[PDB]
Design a protein around this ligand. Structure first.
Ligand code: HEM
Ligand code: HEM
Ligand code: HEM
Lengths: 727, 309, 727, 83
């Protein structure tokens, strides 16, 4: 054979390239020299293919992989065709049960390093030295939808990190919002059954916008805080690179003295916080349901490595009861104004997997996977979680040896007396399978807890009380955090929250549920309640108008760290600009445009009304990445229309729609020269408007203005103008 | 308790209602008077709930289904909480592997009746008498995406019918286009891997618009015929009600005298043929990924029964 | 802690040692220098223990492995004890489904080598060169009983060999009898259900002595040939080392020129053929249900490697229809008088596994696992088998990736486009997962068939006929092979067959089934039928007495290769002798005795009325291996009683019964000096009798005589003398 | 869960309770019971919260653990009284 093109244009270059420049590839082929200890120890299971013979799984070479064995060339397939049956059998058994929740997720390899030793507050080995590099495997996910559901749904996002430390696996299994919907793990199945597709008909997919969700919510006010975050633009992140991560639960750090410190874990996106807007998110679930998975993969292939700073909120044990909320209550956040986040280290995601199924689908994360130096608390949500991941993994991954699946293997030593189980890989040579034993001199042996390399010993928390199935009275406060969140949002963020509630409740068929939910909103904030009520054609009653607001949280009436946008933090590197081409583009504009974008690490995608190429005004041939319809504005962060023969595309319905959609979605638009003729489809005044860059040509001043708008992510001042744009 | 509204507006009318008029409901609650032999035989496994006490799977009534058992109300959860562990355990094990292909599908019960006896050409009992009614269970599906993928993708559609006959179950497992992409079953994994999400990143979902699919097609010209059908508006049906169905293969009909006749099976939509247009289809995967499932459920709830000849 | 005895006696010497001398141990610790390519390829999953810290599966060191985490030392166990929960979880999930048949099996690693190139008749790479060594993994097994059933039951034995060749795994999955019970695989479940424990109460285990088996047999005369083999002493082998092995089916060898030759596979035991006698075997299932497993393992630890010679019955394609029986009928054997076995190679089993579960329990053999140079035939039993193993392994071993379980992995390359599945270990980097593809230049690629290293292509056999569910009329002959077998047995073998049938039919509760079996036997041979009828109190009718015997098999009225004992092939190496001690053993007899046994590789076990030591007449301290009741005569091949203070054991019931049992089971007995007092125990005349070695001391020819008896295995002439005797 | 293939082992005939059993647990391998309850969660208003929790009581009440007093530190320690 030789089916590959002779020019070798089927194989992507093994060097960092921008999104769309090359065909994507398995991580180890795309970036063979990107290495970490985990990545190198997977080498024993990596399988090549080039220059090898096609075989059965038994090593038998296949001569004809196009046909079944049959009696006569038009005859019946024979039972002795063991080659076909192994091939069909393996194919028949490819699928495994998806994750009960978080079925849909995208993952990558990276590494973590602390900024300084933390041995004063924890004996966790991986945090003990700034020169200690810990390999990590991170899986980002949605919650509700299946493995085949869309990425840009409105939903909570999971942010799971597997740390391969020298003293064991530590999994930090968090989300992108700082609290959870419920307090006690006992209600997890209830909450999840409510949010998931309804049981009679299994609708709807990847949406909380249905009766059972809001029914549960209306009846369980502890859910409101997380509901507020889901309804804000927090629920529709622009990318996994631009969202926060949180452990949610208060855990413990244990030092070598044995002193305990309460801790809440944070992931700060070094690319900053950025979210889509609902219409864009929802239309993007249809134009590219793999948008976040793709963005993650392609950012890493381009060298735009996702980077997060690990941060700790540290509270002394003696301060347990100093807040007006319970620290153990997972529906309560610790305002950063009260307890600052300490920057602890940085994680870089620099390598995609080779095989999605082998590494991503089979990865198993557990919040209970902790290491000496860390400890749990009595948080009733976390307590039940400790039981569940262990349990589900047994059927999801077919047995108790899931830790032998390559991606899950610890990189450090593991020796115990556990044996057998389905698909046992380890061949134990120990003469003993029990302890104590004398026949192997008691090895492997226990190890006393200690400052370093010691056995795990639980912090001896004092436990006093009767065996009761009872919610702590301290957890029974449901509206102050939701109010603190609401009040900390900008006015446009508030409006997006109102719009999120209004949209969702509109799809709740039973009108009494919307009413009960509006009643809950009235206990949070009157304005919020009223605005949602008005969109539902619901009138608040007298009594609902007089519900006294909940108290501030420890004196706080807002905390800007809860807003996505209140405090500027955007980074343009890794963002993407759509350039609407024409058949005689002014080459000087393109040059200026492309040079300025490249200087900021901003990618461009060159669009036209057909594929192939177009020729600029000087014969510069411009290759076309996609059509206007093929790569809608939804997939880019800003839109630039260079000068040239504008009449070529000025009647292109698609070209005009591109601009109106970008405009509706608050994206920066830049128009050069006669590209300003496009102002009429998006109805911009002759004197202009903030958010629209326009000039005689696309020089350096024009790009600075454009790039400044992109750093501010979206043009929020345009909100009130998009009403009268039919798009 | 007093959770339901006093006006009873939480319960959908148990009668035919048009789309959007009432919340949808389990079929036997929505339409209790509809019956067939197969639906009556499922009665022994059906479980109600109104007026029953909440229990474990061993029948122990639960007193507090809001909390775990702990040492103190702010204390650690205890291992002896068997109610919590049974509930979470069942919850933890809810999923089963989705179908290798056709993971995304919508089904419904119904019945079949032949217009006349076909005993001159087949001794199949279910086609032997116009008065013989055969209960069916039909699952419509896409091919490529997972169970959580969108309905209005561009894809082939499956149309499987389970016939509960008196001489055994007969399954007529077909598609909405008259041919298949490939000739020999040996290449099934090849073709299915080529159309499915590429193995390095598992993109894209529910789409044949990516390199590996077209690579395969370009190298295996036998696939062109079904590709033509896929690229036409047959790849995006308006609903499962407005698409044809085909068994594709030539099977055999065998009569009582032992005579064999070659037969190709067809399903004719009595609501006629109708498809979306690409743009509409794709936007709709975003606006309502469950549109075909919903459309089918609602037509049946409304009394607009999908009919096929 | 440090629990081993200072002295180091907890650990066995890593050198060959006789059975009972040291504690047995994992193969790689017992014989670290015994290597082969497959043993070395398993090093990647072998796990040590000595000097490592005890950890969870995630690598977290454990401090206290004696206790659960509780609230207070007398308090409730906490859900947060993740160490407890992982430990118990792994334990809870240790088991996997046992094999549907052959659940009870004992396995060992070894190697194979051909005597000369077989290139003229097969292109199979493992048979192409005498210097080409092929690693093997062999499992021996019973059929009916569970994995926990006993070894020395009456049953057929399995003999499965996994050949790890350079061109693929080749599994030869045979039995210890040259035919099977049934003709077509469609009746396998019927036959197996019939022989297995009855469905209402799951009785009996490991036994065909029950109604449903004999009911099936009586209604399906095709089963009679293999029933005869099972009823003979063939069904109770002395050891897996002393039984023949056979592929049963006719397969094809294909040479490079494309010529097909019919072949039946044979394994000749280099230690010769030897079986137990029923009373010993049944009793041995109680005294030591692990007798065969133990003997195999201890033979290997001792260096008495089980050795077998691969042999081929070869038949040209033109001779297919030249026999009275169909070559494709698996209920028919090919008499070695008609088609001799040509010697092909030697297989030596020289290392025990490390972990029984991982290597033995998870091993998956498959007769459809063939390599270029071999092919199948239309044998209808073989045809169905090709389907069954593939299917069963997908649930037994949890998925389609069982070829990745270390023991089953090919040692040669394996590359294809098969992906995912539960427990997927290989991480594929191939950009393509389908062929044909241009994106990986079509790799891995198909390979045309050729003389060496080529793709598999089936032999192009002509197929002609209608699609029918029909038994070939050539298979409809059931009694002539049974008769040929019968006539080839010695008189004492024939009595044992009569006794096996009588015993088994005595356990069939429904008398008419017994009568129906008797009627079938009367179609085989009148003497056989009458002797069994007589033992069951049945009288043959006059019509039965005149049923004409079936024809000879192609002119043969007997074939001595069908007998265990007709042609001497006795080998004493690895056999064992019981030595009955007293408290003043004549040390001179003992030196004479032990050295003579040692010279022939015959082991000994020094037995007494208690454990500890005895002091010989010269002060020599003699370590006791076991008591008379502890290691009964069933476990040894012969008994020697040396001179000394015989009055010490003369009135010991166990010592006397020891000799009665060994005398009853036809074992050689040797009595030195005053040990001749035991002659009255077993009723021996003053003169002496053949089978009893006696002399004033163990000097001169005492040991050579004893060893000549051991070479002939059992004293068959004593049979009539055992009739009486209360033992 | 592995010996009997899933979480629905209470549906295997020999294991089924002979008394009533209703809850909001769904699915799992080999699910026999076909639930008609509109709701698969509680609290719910759509099925009027059925099936419902039952207070503990003298007869036919819901299960309530005996309220033993628990006092001690989180320890992996054998009681000295067991020694
Ligand atoms: C603070 C609250 C919680 C957070 C932050 C959280 C986070 C997550 C994340 C990020 C994942 C996906 C991990 C991956 O990528 O594979 C996940 C999966 C899962 N969660 Fe949690 N979760 C929470 C609550 C719970 C509770 C209360 C339970 C049950 C008692 C639970 C049970 C599960 C299970 C069973 C899975 C699937 C694991 C697997 O199949 O490997 N979660 N959760
Ligand atoms: C004429 C060509 C084919 C048609 C019309 C067809 C149709 C279908 C349909 C409609 C389904 C979904 C059934 C449901 O709703 O549960 C299905 C599933 C399936 N198909 Fe076929 N298919 C074809 C070719 C093949 C081939 C060649 C193979 C393999 C050799 C195959 C293997 C499967 C498997 C394994 C499933 C999943 C079944 C399950 O999990 O129960 N299909 N097919
Ligand atoms: C010539 C006739 C046969 C012989 C010599 C034979 C021999 C064997 C042997 C030695 C084993 C156990 C291998 C091991 O030690 O793992 C075995 C297992 C088995 N046999 Fe065969 N057998 C025969 C007929 C059949 C037939 C006709 C079928 C079904 C069509 C069948 C189905 C099985 C199955 C399902 C297993 C279990 C394998 C596993 O779980 O890996 N056998 N047989």
């Amino acid at each position: 054979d030789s089916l590959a093109p002779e020019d070798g244009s089927h194989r992507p270059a093994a060097e960092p390239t921008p999104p769309g420049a090359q065909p994507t590839a398995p991580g180890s082929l795309k970036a063979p020299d990107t290495r970490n200890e985990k990545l190198n120890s997977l080498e024993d299971v990596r399988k090549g293919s080039e220059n090898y013979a096609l075989t059965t799984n038994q090593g038998v070479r296949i001569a004809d992989d196009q046909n079944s064995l049959r009696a006569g060339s038009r005859g019946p397939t024979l039972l002795e065709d063991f080659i076909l049956r192994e091939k069909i059998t393996h194919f028949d058994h490819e699928r495994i049960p998806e994750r009960i929740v978080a079925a849909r997720g995208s993952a990558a390899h990276g590494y973590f390093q602390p900024y300084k030793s933390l041995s004063d507050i924890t004996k966790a080995d991986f945090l003990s030295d700034p020169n200690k590099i810990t390999p990590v495997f991170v899986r980002f996910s949605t919650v509700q939808g299946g493995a085949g559901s869309a990425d840009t749904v409105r939903d909570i996002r999971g942010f799971a990190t597997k740390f391969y430390t020298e003293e064991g696996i530590f999994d930090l299994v968090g989300n992108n919002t700082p609290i959870f919907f419920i307090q006690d793990a006992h209600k997890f199945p209830d909450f999840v059954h409510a949010v998931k597709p309804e049981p009679h008909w299994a609708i709807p997919q990847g949406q909380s916008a249905h009766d059972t969700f809001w029914d549960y919510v209306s009846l369980q006010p502890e859910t409101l805080h997380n509901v507020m975050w889901a309804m804000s633009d927090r629920g529709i992140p622009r990318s996994y690179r631009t969202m926060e991560g949180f452990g949610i639960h208060t855990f413990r750090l244990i030092n070598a003295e044995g002193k305990a410190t309460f801790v809440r874990f944070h992931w700060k996106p070094l690319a900053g916080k950025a979210s889509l807007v609902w219409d864009e998110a929802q239309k993007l679930t249809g134009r590219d349901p793999d948008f976040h998975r793709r963005e993650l993969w392609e950012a890493i292939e381009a060298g735009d490595f996702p980077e997060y700073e690990l941060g700790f909120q540290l509270i002394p044990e003696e301060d347990e009861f100093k807040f007006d909320f319970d620290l153990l209550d997972p529906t309560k956040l610790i305002p950063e104004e009260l307890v600052p986040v300490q920057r602890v280290g940085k994680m870089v995601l620099n390598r995609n997997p080779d095989n999605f199924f082998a590494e991503n689908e089979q990865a198993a994360f557990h919040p209970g996977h902790i290491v000496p130096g860390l400890d749990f608390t009595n948080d009733p949500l976390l307590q039940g979680r400790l039981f569940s991941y262990t349990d589900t993994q047994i059927s999801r991954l077919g047995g108790p040896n899931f830790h032998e699946i390559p991606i899950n293997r610890p990189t450090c030593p593991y020796h115990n007396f556990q044996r057998d189980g389905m698909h046992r890989m380890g061949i134990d040579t120990n003469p003993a399978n029990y302890e104590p034993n004398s026949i192997n001199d008691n090895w492997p042996r226990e190890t006393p807890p200690g400052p370093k390399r010691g056995g795990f010993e639980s912090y001896q928390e004092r436990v006093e009380g009767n065996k009761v199935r009872e919610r702590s009275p301290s957890f029974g406060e449901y509206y102050s955090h939701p109010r603190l969140f609401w009040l900390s949002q900008t006015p446009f963020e508030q409006r997006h929250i109102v719009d999120g509630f209004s949209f969702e409740l509109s799809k709740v068929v039973r009108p009494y549920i919307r009413e009960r939910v509006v009643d809950q909103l009235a206990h949070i904030d009157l304005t919020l309640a009223q605005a949602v009520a008005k969109n539902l054609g619901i009138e608040l009653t007298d009594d609902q108008l007089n519900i006294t607001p909940p108290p501030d949280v420890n004196g706080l009436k807002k905390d800007p760290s809860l807003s996505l946008y209140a405090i500027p933090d955007g980074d343009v590197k890794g963002r993407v600009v759509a350039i609407l081409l024409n058949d005689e583009v002014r080459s000087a504009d393109l040059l200026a445009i492309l040079k300025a974008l490249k200087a900021k690490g901003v990618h461009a995608k060159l669009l036209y009304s057909r594929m192939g190429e177009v020729t600029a005004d000087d014969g510069t041939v411009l290759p076309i990445a996609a059509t206007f319809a093929g790569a809608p504005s939804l997939t880019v962060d800003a839109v630039i229309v260079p000068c040239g023969n504008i009449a070529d595309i000025a009647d292109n319905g698609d070209a005009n729609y591109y601009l109106m959609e970008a405009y509706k979605h608050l994206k920066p638009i830049a128009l050069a020269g006669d590209a300003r003729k496009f102002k009429a489809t998006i109805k911009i005044a002759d004197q202009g408007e903030e958010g629209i860059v326009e000039a005689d040509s696309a020089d350096g001043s024009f790009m600075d203005e454009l790039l400044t708008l992109m750093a501010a992510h979206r043009v929020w001042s345009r909100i009130p103008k998009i009403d009268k744009i039919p798009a």
